[PDB]
Amino acid sequence: MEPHSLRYNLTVLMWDGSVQSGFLTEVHLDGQPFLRCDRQKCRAKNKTWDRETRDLTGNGKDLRMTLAHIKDQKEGLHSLQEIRVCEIHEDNSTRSSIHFYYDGELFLSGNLETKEWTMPQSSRAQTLAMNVRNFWKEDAMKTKTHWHAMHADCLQELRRYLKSGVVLRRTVPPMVNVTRSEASEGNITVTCRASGFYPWNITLSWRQDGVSLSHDTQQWGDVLPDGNGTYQTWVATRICQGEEQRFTCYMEHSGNHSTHPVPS
């Protein structure tokens, strides 16, 4: 099981030096879209989206003011983004970071576990980084405490969401179907399909007499989204006619080992 994740993606915009009234926050829960919020409201995909609305509107305002301390380009569209993610792992240990993007490029990162700020090396990443850290120094009460509270905010919100039981990581085990085709030159192709499965991680390969065939003696489907929240893949190999009973499709998914022979 992958960890439980919470992301907040905040975007402010500038046209010809002028910071726009709008800002957009995308909230994602366990990687799935969960909320879209503008200046006025959050919306799902009831009106107890008040908490998220009061909160994420404050951050938008702070980031409107932060952008105002960046007047390097009075020409064109420009974006500033504040992205905070936290995770709860299976061991019950936690991850938490915050990243700033300008025109879609990263310039400042903060790991909230280890209290460690990181810059990229480009002269551009650094002028933006410092601009912002300076604005923070400027009596803007960006105390050590602010960041430790953001950390514990993201994690507490995650717990609250998890507890309301909103997005389940339910297992959906694959439907498997072996097929035969290209009956020629005393040669057959056998194909093993797995479809309708979650989660995405799956093992699927042909065996001769219980031994896995090399990767190279085997053709490989990608792992495609089914377009209903699940996945499909396949794997195939060429065998001599009359050797069918020696060849089996072996699959592991979510602690379930299964073997599928070539139907006669």
């Binding site: 002028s18 726009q20 409107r64 003011m65 105002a68």
Partner: protein, 124 residues
């Protein structure tokens, strides 16, 4: 003095000035009108010492500071000049109105953009 006042019942008193904060977002004009309707005006900043509580205000709010065409200077609703070394003014959005923020900052906004706002009665 042990007593702070005269103020409306239910207004914040500090050094005999009276304040109230409003969360219903309004443009500068609707904001100014609302304050005056309660025998007040938008926040005027005349003193770092007497209005030192403004350092602990979160977020940005309409104050009563307006820019005049062929003026270049900023002035209050009441026609007062803005006193020097009280506020740092920052360009944020093109406009002729200013949001208050900590610490003694004015952020320029379009007068038409809805925002939270602070009323103050002058005790003069």
């Amino acid at each position: 003095e042990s007593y702070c006042g005269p103020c409306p019942k239910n207004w914040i008193c500090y050094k005999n000035n009276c304040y109230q904060f409003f969360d219903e977002s309004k443009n500068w004009y609707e904001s100014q009108a609302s304050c005056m309707s309660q025998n007040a005006s938008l926040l005027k900043v005349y003193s770092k010492e007497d209005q030192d509580l403004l350092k602990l205000v979160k977020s940005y709010h309409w104050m009563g500071l307006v820019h005049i065409p062929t003026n270049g200077s900023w002035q209050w609703e009441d026609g007062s000049i803005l006193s020097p070394n009280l506020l740092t003014i920052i360009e944020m959005q093109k406009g002729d109105c200013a949001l208050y923020a900590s610490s003694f900052k004015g952020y320029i906004e379009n007068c038409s953009t809805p925002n939270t706002y602070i009323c103050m009665q002058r005790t003069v």
